[model samples]
Target: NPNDGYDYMQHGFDWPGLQEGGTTKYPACSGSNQSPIDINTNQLMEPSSRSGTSAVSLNGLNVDGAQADGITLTNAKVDLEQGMKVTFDQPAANLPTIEIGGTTKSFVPIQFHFHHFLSEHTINGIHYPLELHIVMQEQDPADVATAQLAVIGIMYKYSENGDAFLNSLQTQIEGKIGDGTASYGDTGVSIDNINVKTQLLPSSLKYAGYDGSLTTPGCDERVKWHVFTTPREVTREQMKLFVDVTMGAHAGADVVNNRMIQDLGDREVYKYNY
Candidate 1:
């Protein structure tokens, strides 16, 4: 909106990513293991080797649903960058992986996104209306081009009847993708069996791990967060097509692209029962 040029601004100062035009600064966006924190839960911790992260429960905990392959989204593409996102086409074969308890090798599921009405990691401090992000990646062929992320957040809430995979995925991405200038390649969208635990998470998968960064920009703290205290269900007429017909993270008007809630400084938040 106001003509979308986008340097940065989640209410200014360059926000969670705060780069150049805001006088350049991304030493980890001010570094301190930053990210959408506040999953307090009375400050829980149970992963001494419960480690920094762990998430397993996609095909509804079967002990052998053949390792949770409950994430499939073929031909998908609709991303106004960070406000209206959906980019998945990871060559299928059942894509959805996450492993870290010190075998150190797992994470893949290119994208999935949302955050609205008021969401961006908060609980115990409370704040939810939608907050989904299933961005995973960690395929180090020895590493180079940045790879080490494990985001798998989910938190929605407010259901007067809505959410059949986000109501047919915003009606197949509302007007069929981009209209705010860019990022909307129509792969004809697809969302087949995503996080299938009781039909979209909650057979008691429970999570709230830590070690974060990358709420955007160079906010990198090595990324590894798995927030999911179970929320699933959204409706404000299915969230007004992403806070109003999409175009955010600076290109204006996708409304509140969310990123403001960091500082769990002593860092050690885990509530995993995966």
Candidate 2:
């Protein structure tokens, strides 16, 4: 029985460590190495990002801007004293849509968050210095439990290769946490500045597919996990900036920030490479 890919324990979901008066008590496993179809340029459905970046079309794909519009990047002056946090507007609705391999999925942008080694989140048994995650939900906010969730993990490494998208961002990231806001309607330097292809896993996009619980409370197992094969690049100093801002008020406590990877039973985890 596949547990309908819903039930927690029966399907090998990682139960969380119980906290004082905490509702979390189920034991869970890591869902790393999940599945994602290898992106074949020949079979590309169409241009992915509907709004941001240049328009590039392909067969078997149709990238709608409706979902991407849910979150947009605006340009504001850079302030290095504080780290950057992608701000959103009230009534943040609509999920960014992506069509690939003839399959369409809705990506709901819940909150734009950052990540690092933080004594956690290891890939292939090796933990990098830092990682940034733009957490998202497949489910519209109206209904969460029944919604499928996902995470796009970006890694940071010391590099001089010069990523045009990132180079532009580095200038804006000069401020501290809550330092300033992105000027709305300014596409010059908003979410549009992020180039997924260049900033994410290359040809070998490795992911762990499994039935697992949500990383946060009410940890629903309705998510299909996708861990990228290649992590993005960020400098050591960049890592410090993210940590400082993220841990500002909530420091010292375990915080249970990153969710543990869930277990994979007889289910098959998928991986793709260009």
Candidate 3:
């Protein structure tokens, strides 16, 4: 949080460039580009799956402070019903950060899921190897669009196996990465204590803005998207494993999967700060 940030864009507008002079000039709003692509209803005409450089760097990052629970390999298992929703208990509190824009933010955990792509990005082209949204609830839930939700967008770089958080947890259910309901899952796992500040990178410091519908059902466009330029680590194996298990019947063939990205139309893309 105490360093330079990364370059970000939404629909070709420069997100990182705006942070330079504290002056943001966004694109003319349209109904074309959207964030958090909805995989449920919208049939994407051209799924622009773009590739890019490795987003996160391990420099000046701390990877210590682990309390191991011994044994090895822990995987959370679960069984999904024909039509059931499992919302993870809110994740543990995240440490706050200081950005160039003088904005203060923290990480708030939401349910974790996987998409078909090994690399996560929107139709507009902004992407990461994998994507995560630790969505936070606002004091006024009705004002979500304008409200900033504390989100931690994670991407897989290398293998996430040795990560103290993932490692210690591996033994618990590492093998349970299976398909079904009523089996098992993970929870109460706190990243705050894991020196996760290193997981924070300047690359993810910028963002693109949009008044889009929630990527999930209830198509509520009440969101202000802030995807990261930098991503953390997760192994290729880990990525594949996560994807396979979370797919359709493998994931109990759950519906209401993902939402299509909304068009910026005339909306302005903003840089992330605080």
Candidate 4:
């Protein structure tokens, strides 16, 4: 049976390592192939491999046509440890399927969440102000466990103009600040309110490909990552809103919700620029 994703984040907040008393609870956090590594572009290869980069097709990413009304917003809230997240009550079956490179496998959209001050892969050692991860699972019928996961990481840089999609729920998100636990309660906003297609995937599909584990606890090593090269823009004001909410609980605290960069070791990162 698929595990409740919520249960994975309940552990104490000790990033990059374990809390003193909570030690040894999550060994995977120290495991090899852990995620959120620095993407040194100069070292990335263009050769062929499962980690090799290639053109990716994100079909049905837009919220238009016969499936515009299909998405259902289930939860919209922030967790002190995980930052902000938006979940769907049920998976949108008609949602887009991602075709990475020339692979025949199709990964379907699941849920998306965010990280503050960037996380889960960097570009040329530069960290963006924000990063969004859109999680997808394999579409195979036999793989009932959906053990295979694909996550598309989108970076958001500080800009003069705020993100149209993220700002839409600024008020609602602000209202839920300091909420340490998951809030399943209604936030009076719907997923339909956002331009998911244009906001989620970038016009330029160029990305860095790698195999890594989730940044959160359990640290499952089932992910195939696609960190986009093109960054979306969010206003400085918008960035402050999220930062303030994140740091509001712990006064004068530097909120670093992201995991520390893991050692790449011998892992190869492929650059797919088409």
Local accuracy of candidate 2 as per-residue lDDT tens digits, 212-274: 344544454555444454655556554544444334423432222344443334444333332
Summarize candidate 1's per-residue lDDT along 56-169 as a digit string, tens digits: 433322222234444444566555444556775663444345556546454556766776777878899888887877776775535644677777788878878877877766
Q: Rank the models by lDDT, top first.
A: 4, 1, 2, 3
Query: Candidate 4 versus the native: TM-score?
Result: 0.72
Better of 1 and 4 by TM-score: 4
Which residue runs of candidate 2 sit more than 4 Å off their true CA positions? Answer: 1-105, 118-121, 139-142, 157-173, 176-208, 251-262
Q: Write the per-residue lDDT of candidate 3 for residues 1-274, one digit (tens) a residue.
A: 1002311123223321343366433322222434554222122222122121111222212232132211111122222221112244443333232221233333333334333233334424544445555344433334545554433344445654523343433333344434321232232322223233332332444343333434432233444344554455655554443433334233433222323345445444433331
TM-score of 3: 0.47
Poorest 10 consecutive residues by lDDT, candidate 4: 1-10
Residue-level error in angstroms, candidate 3, position 178 = 10
In model 1, the Cα lDDT at residue 28 comes to 55
Q: Please list the residue runs of candidate 1 whose C-alpha ends up more than 4 Å from where it truly belongs after superposition.
A: 1-38, 46-76, 79-84, 88-102, 118-121, 128-132, 137-150, 154-225, 228-243, 246-274
- lDDT per residue for candidate 4 within 1-274, as digits (tens), equals 0123222232224544544576665667777888878988787776466533343455555443236444433443333323555555435455545444545566666667777765546788888888999887877646655367888899988888777777866655655543632232223234344345655666677788888888877787878888888888887678766565554534443445566678887788878773
- C-alpha root-mean-square deviation, each candidate: 17.0, 10.6, 14.2, 6.0
Who is ahead in lDDT, 1 or 2?
A: 1
Q: What lDDT score belongs to each candidate, Candidate 1 first?
A: 0.63, 0.39, 0.34, 0.63
Give the Cα error of residue 264 in candidate 2, in Å. Answer: 2.8
Could you tell me how far off, in angstroms, the CA of residue 229 lies in candidate 2 after the best superposition? 0.4
- Tell me the lDDT of model 1 at 79: 53
